[PDB]
Design an enzyme around this catalytic site. Structure first.
Site, PDB file in Angstrom:
ATOM      1  CG  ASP A   1       9.832  10.769  -1.003  1.00  0.00           C
ATOM      2  OD1 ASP A   1       9.236  11.515  -0.196  1.00  0.00           O
ATOM      3  OD2 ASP A   1      10.137   9.585  -0.727  1.00  0.00           O
TER       4      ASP A   1
ATOM      5  CB  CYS B   1     -13.178   0.311   0.865  1.00  0.00           C
ATOM      6  SG  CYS B   1     -14.735   0.684   0.048  1.00  0.00           S
TER       7      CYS B   1
ATOM      8  N   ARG C   1      18.647   3.379   5.228  1.00  0.00           N
ATOM      9  CA  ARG C   1      17.352   3.775   5.795  1.00  0.00           C
ATOM     10  C   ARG C   1      16.490   4.636   4.868  1.00  0.00           C
ATOM     11  CG  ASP C   2      18.849   6.541   2.265  1.00  0.00           C
ATOM     12  OD1 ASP C   2      19.166   7.629   2.794  1.00  0.00           O
ATOM     13  OD2 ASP C   2      19.634   5.571   2.130  1.00  0.00           O
ATOM     14  CG  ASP C   3      12.478   8.638   2.452  1.00  0.00           C
ATOM     15  OD1 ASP C   3      13.159   9.424   1.756  1.00  0.00           O
ATOM     16  OD2 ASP C   3      12.193   8.863   3.651  1.00  0.00           O
TER      17      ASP C   3
ATOM     18  N   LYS D   1      -8.990   0.989   8.555  1.00  0.00           N
ATOM     19  CA  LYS D   1      -7.945   1.108   9.573  1.00  0.00           C
ATOM     20  C   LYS D   1      -6.664   1.708   8.999  1.00  0.00           C
TER      21      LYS D   1
ATOM     22  N   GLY E   1       1.190   2.494 -16.153  1.00  0.00           N
ATOM     23  CA  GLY E   1       1.448   1.833 -14.888  1.00  0.00           C
ATOM     24  C   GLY E   1       1.019   0.379 -14.880  1.00  0.00           C
ATOM     25  CG  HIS E   2       1.215  -3.852 -12.820  1.00  0.00           C
ATOM     26  ND1 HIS E   2       1.038  -4.731 -13.868  1.00  0.00           N
ATOM     27  CD2 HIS E   2       0.955  -4.557 -11.692  1.00  0.00           C
ATOM     28  CE1 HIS E   2       0.704  -5.918 -13.394  1.00  0.00           C
ATOM     29  NE2 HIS E   2       0.652  -5.842 -12.075  1.00  0.00           N
ATOM     30  CB  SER E   3      -3.892  -1.803 -12.277  1.00  0.00           C
ATOM     31  OG  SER E   3      -4.724  -2.534 -13.136  1.00  0.00           O
TER      32      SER E   3
HETATM   33 MG    MG Z   1       9.295  12.036   1.769  1.00  0.00          MG
END
Ligand code: MG
Ligand code: MG
Lengths: 335, 319
Positions: free
Chosen positions: A79, A5, A37-39, A8, A127-129
């Site tokens: 992370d 589902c 630029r950080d994650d 791609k 959480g949220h959905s």
């Molecule tokens: Mg990472």
């Protein structure tokens, strides 16, 4: 029953540069960890403790809903570990096509998430959905790290040895699953590799000798190691065979299952690499969903560390070293 | 709808809010400080990209304030049909988000993005509160008076504008109301007599009120007149302008409410995207709550009260 589902899954879908450039700029501060630029974002509380906040989510990588949830949660939590933080909680992020897929499946995905969270020592705290045309799952994870660890930032150094906590090839194995993936131990091994939680990172950061620590995900080994060399103004020399690898990756690569992510990666980092044979290039540019930790560690620890890896049972792969930048030499060169 | 979490089994503390349902997760560091995490995200609720960003962000940060916390960080949640809508539209939504974040005194710090067939934007936001000052939605007790910090009628205005029924005097009111930040929450947290607090969002005032009652094992009595309403929300409800989510709300909790006429029902169940804070306050602290609210430019009068459970869950001194 449906990575069918997605669809791609590479590489204009997950964190499309374009969109990624929307971190912008600012300096009101207390926020030390992502303005550019950080994650991940990091906020100093002033008592010597900083809170980490990080989010990641994607479309289904595997067909098994439980595993998909585990993997996505594991990836999101990585992370925090790669900065040497401890996760204290997580909340789910879920888009789901209810007019298409039953809530049963969605519950499986979420239970996967919950499992991966338990492996990290935390709870999935809700959480949220929403209804969405394509399934999306991930987490928003919160963590804590001593402020000194972030505020004093190595900056790896010339002389550092290079270590990898997980073998490479996740991208190619999942791509080989598109078709031609063979029944042998190429079934579920990529899932098992992805679901190894990077929990040892939290310990690796308690060592001084280790100068730099990152997780190898999606930019591939080339991208992450090149980024580690950009700061510290140093180049890298890597033994291409020492390089821990998933079973039968090169066969799949030369037989042609390479995700488009690797191409995106080569367009980004390719100039930093010597001119390389296609299969090797595809290996080094292979995005690793929920990959391991790349470590820049120096001798005075080559073992202290090592010990630790052993304590977590990961131990461990030396792929090369860091050399002072010299002219005519590539930033990352492969031997 | 969802219910998809919890579960079968479980892990434990020092998680304070979770898991039943509160607005946000809270974790206790043993140092007198707790950390709050919440997330929210939406498909576009307006035409204007910037205002959509503004609104989704306001709504997401609201839950930190509902816990009585102070927002510290926010990170973006974005998915976008890159082959359909322009990246510049995306930057506009994001900019709405950054602006709202600034209104909460925080940066919008990066985020995560994907290509998605339909636009989705929201935040993951982090906050902090002294541990003993957390204000859950479930801790109310009989004797409390109820307060509401934003006037009702957002849904009716959104759909009146959508249905071209919106009078010119009312242009853009819903958006300004939505974009009001629930910042007062962080101050109400300092009041020992504020027993419980939540935000009214889309489940309707009555839905969130029901959650307070269920949570605390008490019942409520509300005075329809006393409830703050948006100008011409009553009139717009007559020949509504009554969004489809409203009947979903009355389907969900309607069996818990007393008799109320069509129009009244429709206002009180009306979805409020990014709506006001709903407070349960002991009489002893009423004054402080009103004066604290006054600081933020909010004039408060009780909309009702909490009593020991006997009959139906929430009753309206209808009208
Ligand atoms: Mg990472
Ligand atoms: Mg809420």
């Amino acid at each position: 029953h449906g990575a069918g589902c997605g669809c791609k899954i590479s590489p204009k879908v997950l964190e499309t540069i374009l969109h990624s450039e929307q971190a912008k700029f600012v300096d009101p501060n207390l926020l030390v960890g992502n303005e550019t630029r950080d994650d991940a974002a990091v906020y100093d509380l002033g008592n010597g403790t900083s809170v980490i906040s990080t989010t990641d989510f994607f479309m289904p990588i595997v067909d098994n809903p439980f595993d998909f949830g585990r993997i996505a949660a594991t990836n999101a939590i990585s992370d925090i570990f790669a900065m040497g933080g401890k996760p204290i909680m997580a909340i789910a992020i879920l888009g789901w096509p209810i007019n298409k897929l039953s809530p049963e499946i969605a519950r499986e995905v979420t239970e996967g998430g919950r499992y991966a969270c338990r492996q990290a020592g935390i709870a999935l705290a809700g959480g949220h959905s929403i209804d969405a045309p394509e399934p999306i799952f991930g987490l928003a994870v919160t963590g804590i790290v001593p402020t000194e660890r972030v505020k004093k930032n190595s900056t790896a150094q010339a002389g550092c040895k290079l270590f990898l906590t997980k073998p490479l090839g996740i991208g190619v194995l999942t791509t080989a699953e598109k078709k031609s993936l063979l029944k042998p131990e190429h079934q579920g091994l990529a899932t098992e590799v992805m679901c190894r939680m990077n929990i040892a990172g939290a310990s690796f950061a308690n060592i001084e000798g280790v100068k730099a620590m990152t997780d190898v995900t999606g930019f591939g080994l080339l991208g992450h190691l090149s980024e580690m060399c950009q700061g510290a103004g140093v180049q890298a020399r890597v033994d291409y065979e020492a390089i821990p690898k998933l079973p039968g990756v090169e066969e799949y690569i030369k037989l042609g299952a390479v995700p488009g992510g690797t191409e995106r990666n080569f367009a980004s980092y390719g100039h930093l690499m010597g001119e390389m044979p296609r299969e090797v290039r595809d290996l080094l540019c292979d995005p690793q969903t929920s990959g391991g930790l790349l470590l820049a560690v120096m001798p005075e620890a080559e073992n202290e560390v090592k010990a630790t890896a052993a304590e977590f049972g990961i131990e461990l792969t030396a792929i090369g070293e860091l050399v002072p930048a010299r002219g005519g030499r590539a930033m990352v060169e492969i031997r």
